[PDB]
């Protein structure tokens, strides 16, 4: 039949105005957000490294790092 309406995957709600999908699956404007710092990445720049997404800024901040002295 026809019933099946597109909800939110992160707290599981339904979607009415604002939203995104993510790998085949829908996403929150507000919970399609960075995993270490909760940014709303919908708009911003963003990617993934395996299940969750990351910010830029984050990615080369948990992973990523310098030298020693510095
Ligand atoms: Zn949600
Ligand atoms: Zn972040």
Do not use: M
């Not at 790998?23 to 395996?50: I, M, N, Y």
């Amino acid at each position: 039949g026809s019933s099946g309406s597109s909800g939110c995957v992160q707290c599981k709600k339904p979607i009415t105005t604002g939203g995104v999908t993510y790998r085949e699956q829908p996403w929150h404007k507000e919970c399609f957000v960075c995993t270490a710092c909760r940014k709303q990445l919908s708009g911003q720049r963003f990617t993934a490294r395996d299940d969750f997404a990351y910010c830029l800024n984050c990615f080369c901040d948990l992973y990523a790092s310098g030298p020693s002295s510095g």
